Amino acid sequence: TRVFKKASPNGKLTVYLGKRDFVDHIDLVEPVDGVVLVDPEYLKERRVYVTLTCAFRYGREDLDVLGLTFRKDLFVANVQSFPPAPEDKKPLTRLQERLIKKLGEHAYPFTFEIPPNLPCSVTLQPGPEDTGKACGVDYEVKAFCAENLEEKIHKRNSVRLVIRKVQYAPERPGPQPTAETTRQFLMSDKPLHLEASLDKEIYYHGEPISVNVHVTNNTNKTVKKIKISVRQYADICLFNTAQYKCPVAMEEADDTVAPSSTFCKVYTLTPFLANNREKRGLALDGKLKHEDTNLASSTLLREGANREILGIIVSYKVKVKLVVSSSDVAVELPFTLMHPKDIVFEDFARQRLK
Ligand SMILES: O=P(O)(O)O[C@H]1[C@H](OP(=O)(O)O)[C@@H](OP(=O)(O)O)[C@H](OP(=O)(O)O)[C@@H](OP(=O)(O)O)[C@H]1OP(=O)(O)O
Ligand SMILES: [Mg+2]
């Protein structure tokens, strides 16, 4: 197997994790299981704690910073760790029993169970014009040394790392998302009928989207060209609320539809951060520099669910538009963008770009 690890500035403490991206379904959220490597001597009476903070921050770009003008803690989990507290139990995973057996007796576990209805790692990077500042929800994991819970943590024998809560939806049976609209122009009842659909409801980053477009032109006019697009919507709903709208895929085609005839065709679009990096105003599931970052996924939410608490709500839509020679006639279908998915330690730091 493969495990990521990071040590405190003074290599006296070291965290070990088997993933840096935890996949949350709807039912459950993959458990966050790891272990710390301690120096019992180096710390007399001092202890080892590990906590999991989940918070929304606005201003600078990473929670652990001193330039953000707003912050709301959405979750906190503290754990007693070096001094094994019989109180604070666990069964123990098996990347653990394994790990502990390769690190020794100074190896200590910890486990976090992230509630299911918490927002997932989403980051929105405002661009050049946009008057808003950066913001996002991050999951900080920290293991530090101290006597009491309260003494003062020091950026030295302490370690922090951002993990990620990524959303996975399985794709059900259901009907393909459809949309249609009829249009009658001035001086005539002859209609121009538009109707589109997507091959499915759920897609994953990198996965192509097929759009079945059908056009029934009873009109005496002509459809010059057709434009297909995929747009993202990001609603920052906490400190300073605002709504960002941004196209992540377009595909205009000079397809013609003559008077009194029926048209038909299948278009293929691919929303991607790569062909959008540049762009800014959109929501991502991480930082840009970080390779391994995608477009923010669709914020799932429920009945009687608190929207503000989610931080940034993200959604996608496919828009079909006919330019009729005007008032183009158009429809839009909504879809859900989701996430896919001998030891030998490896750094934790996320791989970079170019
Ligand atoms: O479909 P297009 O020919 O590409 O025009 C669209 C678009 O909508 P249209 O179908 O509606 O006229 C927007 O109008 P709405 O979708 O909001 O109704 C508009 O967005 P805003 O006017 O809300 O800003 C956006 O411009 P932008 O990307 O600056 O938001 C612009 O996009 P296109 O040139 O990029 O495709
Ligand atoms: Mg599926």
Side-chain angles (χ1 to χ4, degrees), residues 1-11 13-89 91-277 279-302 304-341 343-354:
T1 317
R2 156 204 193 189
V3 310
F4 312 84
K5 47 93 167 184
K6 180 167 195 179
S8 53
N10 56 283
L13 188 48
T14 302
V15 193
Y16 289 75
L17 285 165
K19 308 172 174 297
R20 27 193 171 182
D21 294 6
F22 297 72
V23 181
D24 135 300
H25 316 294
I26 285 64
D27 207 72
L28 289 174
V29 196
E30 291 199 317
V32 186
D33 65 303
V35 304
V36 295
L37 192 56
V38 199
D39 189 311
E41 301 310 309
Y42 170 91
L43 67 170
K44 73 159 183 196
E45 266 273 287
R46 220 157 34 179
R47 308 184 178 196
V48 161
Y49 301 87
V50 184
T51 78
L52 182 47
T53 306
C54 171
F56 172 90
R57 39 86 196 167
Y58 193 111
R60 268 190 192 178
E61 196 177 306
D62 305 324
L63 204 47
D64 62 337
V65 184
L66 246 180
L68 35 49
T69 40
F70 179 76
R71 166 170 170 167
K72 181 179 184 60
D73 302 315
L74 310 168
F75 185 62
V76 176
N78 283 85
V79 186
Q80 166 61 174
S81 207
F82 167 67
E87 342 170 330
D88 316 320
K89 173 210 188 174
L92 272 215
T93 197
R94 315 205 164 173
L95 184 53
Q96 289 187 301
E97 78 190 19
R98 294 259 300 286
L99 262 190
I100 296 174
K101 197 175 173 188
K102 186 184 178 85
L103 288 291
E105 65 168 303
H106 293 357
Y108 276 81
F110 68 72
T111 312
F112 291 113
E113 293 143 64
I114 309 181
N117 306 338
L118 253 43
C120 295
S121 296
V122 56
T123 302
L124 184 150
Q125 181 49 69
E129 178 67 43
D130 288 318
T131 202
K133 351 294 175 295
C135 68
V137 311
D138 305 304
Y139 286 76
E140 180 198 75
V141 193
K142 73 187 194 203
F144 57 110
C145 313
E147 314 183 308
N148 183 68
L149 324 307
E150 81 191 43
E151 194 53 0
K152 204 160 135 227
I153 297 181
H154 299 279
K155 305 189 149 180
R156 333 170 201 178
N157 65 197
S158 60
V159 274
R160 286 191 190 178
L161 45 86
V162 194
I163 61 173
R164 233 156 50 158
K165 188 199 170 178
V166 290
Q167 187 98 57
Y168 171 99
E171 186 178 4
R172 277 166 154 189
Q176 301 177 38
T178 329
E180 48 159 88
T181 198
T182 292
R183 178 61 175 275
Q184 289 186 192
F185 299 94
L186 283 177
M187 297 172 246
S188 172
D189 291 328
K190 309 272 75 184
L192 193 204
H193 185 61
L194 177 61
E195 33 198 347
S197 62
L198 303 183
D199 48 310
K200 56 214 198 71
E201 227 283 294
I202 303 179
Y203 295 98
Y204 305 104
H205 314 116
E207 181 173 6
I209 300 172
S210 267
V211 186
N212 326 295
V213 172
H214 194 84
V215 176
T216 302
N217 189 196
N218 291 284
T219 256
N220 70 168
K221 303 169 176 295
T222 296
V223 187
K224 280 168 50 66
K225 46 187 292 176
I226 305 176
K227 302 190 177 177
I228 320 293
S229 59
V230 178
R231 248 181 168 175
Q232 179 195 70
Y233 300 75
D235 289 346
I236 287 67
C237 46
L238 225 29
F239 183 46
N240 172 183
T241 69
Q243 312 93 305
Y244 290 84
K245 165 167 221 181
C246 176
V248 298
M250 291 187 294
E251 214 262 83
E252 56 199 347
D254 285 317
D255 300 312
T256 251
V257 191
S260 301
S261 41
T262 50
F263 181 86
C264 197
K265 191 172 194 188
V266 170
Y267 303 83
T268 294
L269 298 219
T270 312
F272 265 144
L273 187 41
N275 330 228
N276 293 140
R277 311 223 155 164
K279 216 153 301 179
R280 285 214 190 183
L282 46 55
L284 313 164
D285 63 338
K287 335 198 65 173
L288 267 190
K289 68 183 58 200
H290 283 159
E291 165 155 1
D292 94 303
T293 309
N294 283 282
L295 299 167
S297 52
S298 291
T299 293
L300 297 201
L301 70 170
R302 333 151 188 189
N306 190 168
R307 196 178 197 258
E308 295 192 312
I309 269 183
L310 293 181
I312 307 171
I313 270 64
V314 193
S315 65
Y316 293 81
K317 271 187 272 171
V318 164
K319 177 175 195 157
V320 177
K321 189 174 191 174
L322 307 167
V323 168
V324 161
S325 201
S326 174
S327 289
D328 341 51
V329 203
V331 288
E332 66 187 17
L333 333 91
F335 65 100
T336 312
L337 188 61
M338 292 275 94
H339 191 91
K341 298 169 187 174
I343 313 302
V344 183
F345 311 139
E346 165 190 336
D347 292 300
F348 184 77
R350 288 163 185 298
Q351 186 190 181
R352 306 254 200 157
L353 237 44
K354 321 172 178 183

